[PDB]
Design a protein around this ligand. Structure first.
Ligand SMILES: CCOC(=O)c1ccc(OCCC2CCN(c3ccc(C)nn3)CC2)cc1
Ligand SMILES: *C(=O)CCCCCCCCCCCCC
Ligand SMILES: *C(=O)CCCCCCCCCCCCC
Lengths: 4, 266, 59, 279, 62, 266, 62, 4
């Protein structure tokens, strides 16, 4: 995933 | 210790002091004491005016007489105070103004008199009108100032289409607004039961959907005083006692100064 | 912006009155509200800021 | 865990504590319980107030409007080829009464559209499936004069394109108020009459009314060109408040509504006749 | 970015904490469903707006 | 650095801003900036009112026209401001009031015009009267408010004993008070020399023998504007330019609130 | 390959950072929805295209 | 994920  | 009581109060604001030897504690409307607009809730950017002791003091309105036929009385705030010394001036010289209040209602009698006054503080007190016409009550008739208004026992419709009175028709058991009086107790209130107390003291915060608004275009609080139980004395059928309303502005602040507003109350 | 000749002088009052009262018909009434007194000179132009003073959060 | 307070095993009394006595003049309600006036047992309470939360109380889609729109040959007179509706919860009475238990409210709004249609005339042939265009026109934006004029180009206004037979149309709207809360009641005016005014109409206003167009309108049309035979249709609008917060409680409307304000006219007799000593 | 929480089980099948999963698909929070895990508060501001709030066993008016 | 100047000023008080592109620095009367009454110099014990931005702002008085025959103009403070918005209200609703001021006097013309205005700020400006009668000038005539008064070139005595005018007779070279004008420079002053500057800015402290006094009974400062050198232009014998006086209250504080004072200016 | 980010919550339900999830299904970036997390910039290139940009309190023309 |  990629959490900002 | 010493001998203090729930029934003996002193209210001191500015150069004014009230003493009561027979009160029924005091209500702080919705649990909130009056306060100033915080920087993180602020909206007009201009530096406000805060007149403190010159506007936040006890103004006593003209006395009304309670008698056996009395149906009820009502005032709007700030309207009731529009002509009260430096408060009224600050109110009309600025576009924006907020205020909290201490309402102190006065009614004394004797151990042999009888009756119960319902003192009600209502947020956004919208009243019903005259006519077939909806939302037709005029600014001049909506705002009686110090004089206040009265309730009626039934709906007598303003019949003359040609030259309409454009007034309110506040029916007592409908709280003048389409709901039942017995439920008005969900609103901030006290009862002046003549065997118990001479008075009622309700402290009011500024309540509104905005931090500040036009005091000249809009009333925030309404004061409704309806006799829950009628005035009675000995056997004298035309008994009559005075009810005196004393109000003080609290944490008053003003924004948007310019020339004075002169409304037409004619 | 004053676009007059350099030899022309003058002082002007420019104002903003927040709503609710009579719209100003006289300098005397305009004086009372937010205002700038512009003096004409080498700095050709004058800025008046109309400050956000309002009841609602958005107009 | 959200259950209510357990009941306490309470016993006999002979004391100078008198909770049964109070003074309602003070403005307060006595915080009493059965254990103050009677001997109670210990009950472990499992009951909860989960359905009466402000959210659960409003969490239901309510009908607030029926917009009637036709698709027929554009003739030269007053017709319903397109319709407009000022958005409001006040045309209906039911949701209006629930939201009015409170003075102020703040919420997001969900709109669900149930479209239904039918044949008007016994028979002129039939119609192919109709597509509906619901356009939101916010105050300021140009209102359509014709069912197929340029405003329906909708370059910046939100529009819904619904197809008959499909699952009912649905959209969400944020808290769009000009203030920190929607006012369900406004004890005021939008204009004030000044002494210096020319006529006394300049400063005249409707009591309790704020903005003229308040939130704008929904414009509805059948995007289809007219069939030979006419099709009448109804767009039913369901409204549901979500992510709801409410302030300052008010008494419920006890007499029938008479317009947008608090005005009453008739049926001012809400209560039944019942004898004082009759059960 | 999946949200997981316990259902409050009413009628239990003959089979204990049962969970449900929620995921937001939209950027605008207005688009979200209702969480319905709502906390409560005291009646007090309404049932006792008093400056001197008194104990139920002592005389209301002293 | 950057390019700042003695001649380019900005005065900002409350919601009011003045810009001048041709000033002559600015005078602070007697070296003292306005200030509030200190606790160790305090005398009325009641909590004061301090209206801040609503009273301490720039009020522009009615413009006067300077012409070839103009002998002089004079105003008194606080009198000049008695009707200026919320300041006047605070002044008349309270027995006691103190104030400092920023006086900004405006007179512009052209490189080809000529003349010099003497702008004088005087503590306790007592003027001479009409008559044979000593100290007979009436309150109504002593106080012209915003309109101010004028100077005269010679003493023409009010001759009619029967119905006396009870006015002042201020003779210019005697500063209207029995001394010579050339010495008025011992008082806080500036000169509007038309080849040098459009304006004069004098800041004034509250000066008095008391910390605070009755503003309605007593003027603290007097503003005298006498043309030291006459107005002249090109060869046009009836030249005429406007002189505009703009004044702001500073550090205003009020004591002894009660009902409004309504003086008789008739 | 799921993308997770914070919604800017406007009207808060009576229940704090709420997130939403995004996944791209297509190879061609043109096929993607709009991220709408857009950064801003100065008016300057337009409001002050000056070679000697001066301080607002100093004389504009010196 | 986020488990409450
Ligand atoms: C002042 C009393 O009224 C209300 O409190 C109240 C009444 C209506 C409310 O709805 C929000 C206003 C509008 C804003 C946008 N809107 C939209 C927007 C897009 C579409 C396709 N359809 N409808 C329709 C509703 C919200 C509050
Ligand atoms: C956090 O949500 C990461 C885990 C995502 C698991 C797969 C979800 C598949 C559905 C994605 C929905 C995209 C909606 C715009
Ligand atoms: C990164 O995305 C890995 C996690 C994927 C979780 C399951 C997603 C299920 C949907 C896959 C979409 C395929 C689209 C072409």
């Amino acid at each position: 995933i990629s959490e900002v | 210790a010493c001998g203090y009581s729930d029934r003996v109060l002193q209210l001191t604001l500015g150069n004014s002091t009230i003493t009561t030897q027979e009160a029924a504690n005091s209500v702080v409307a919705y649990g909130r004491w009056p306060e100033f607009i915080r920087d993180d809730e602020a909206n007009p950017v201009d530096q406000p005016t805060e007149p403190d002791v010159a506007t936040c003091r006890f103004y006593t309105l003209d006395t009304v007489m309670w008698g056996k036929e009395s149906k009820g009385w009502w005032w709007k705030l700030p309207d009731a105070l529009r002509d009260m010394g430096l408060f009224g001036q600050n109110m009309y010289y600025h576009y924006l103004g907020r205020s909290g209040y201490t309402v102190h209602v006065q009614c004394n009698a004797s151990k042999f008199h009888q009756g119960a006054l319902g003192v009600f503080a209502i947020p956004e007190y919208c009243l019903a009108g005259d006519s077939d016409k909806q939302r037709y009550t005029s600014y001049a008739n909506a705002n009686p100032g110090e004089r206040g208004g009265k309730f009626y026992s039934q709906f007598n419709k303003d019949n003359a289409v040609t030259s309409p009175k454009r007034e309110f028709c506040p029916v007592d058991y409908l709280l003048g607004c389409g709901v039942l009086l017995g439920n008005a107790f969900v609103y901030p209130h006290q009862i002046i039961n003549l065997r118990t107390n001479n008075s009622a003291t309700i402290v009011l915060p500024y309540v509104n959907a905005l931090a500040i608004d036009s005091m000249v275009k809009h009333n925030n609080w309404g004061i409704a005083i309806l006799p829950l139980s009628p005035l009675d004395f000995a056997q004298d059928s035309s008994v009559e006692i005075p009810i005196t309303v004393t109000i003080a502005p609290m944490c008053s602040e003003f924004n948007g100064l310019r020339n004075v507003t002169a409304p037409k109350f004619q | 912006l004053f676009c007059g000749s350099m030899m022309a002088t003058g002082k002007i009052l420019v104002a903003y009155a927040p709503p609710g009262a009579q719209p100003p018909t006289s300098r005397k009434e305009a004086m009372l509200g937010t205002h700038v007194i512009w003096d004409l000179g080498l700095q050709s132009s004058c800025t008046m800021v109309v400050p956000w003073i309002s009841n609602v959060t958005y107009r | 865990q959200d259950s209510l307070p357990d009941t306490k095993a309470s016993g006999p009394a002979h004391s100078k504590e008198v909770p049964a006595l109070t003074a309602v003049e003070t403005g307060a309600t006595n915080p009493l319980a059965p254990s103050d006036t009677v001997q109670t047992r210990h009950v472990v309470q499992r009951r909860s107030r989960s359905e009466s939360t402000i959210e659960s109380f409003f969490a239901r889609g309510a009908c607030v409007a029926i917009i009637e729109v036709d698709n027929e040959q554009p003739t030269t007179r007053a017709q319903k080829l397109f319709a407009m509706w000022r958005i409001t919860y006040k045309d209906t009475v039911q949701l209006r009464r629930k939201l009015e238990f409170f003075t102020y409210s703040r919420f997001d709004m969900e709109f669900t559209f149930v479209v239904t249609a039918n044949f008007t005339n016994a028979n002129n042939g039939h119609a192919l499936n109709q597509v509906y265009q619901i356009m939101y026109i916010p105050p300021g934006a140009p209102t359509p004069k014709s069912w197929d004029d340029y405003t329906w180009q909708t370059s910046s206004n939100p529009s819904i394109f619904y197809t008959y037979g499909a699952a009912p149309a649905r959209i969400s709207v944020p808290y769009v108020g000009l203030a920190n809360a929607y006012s369900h009641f406004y004890d005021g005016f939008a204009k004030v009459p000044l002494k210096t005014d020319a006529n006394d109409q300049i400063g005249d206003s409707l009591y309790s009314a704020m903005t003229v167009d308040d939130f704008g309108v929904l414009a509805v049309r059948v995007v289809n060109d007219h069939n030979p035979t006419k099709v009448t249709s109804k767009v039913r609008i369901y409204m549901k408040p979500k992510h709801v917060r409410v302030w300052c409680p008010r008494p419920p409307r006890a007499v029938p509504y008479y317009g947008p304000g608090v005005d009453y006219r008739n049926n001012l007799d809400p209560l039944s006749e019942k004898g004082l000593t009759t059960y | 970015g999946a949200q997981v929480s316990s259902q409050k089980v009413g009628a239990h099948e003959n089979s204990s904490t049962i969970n449900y999963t929620t995921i937001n698909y939209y950027k605008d929070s207005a688009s979200n469903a209702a969480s319905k895990q709502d906390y409560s508060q005291d009646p007090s501001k309404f049932t006792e707006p008093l400056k001197d709030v008194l104990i139920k066993t002592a005389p209301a008016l002293n």
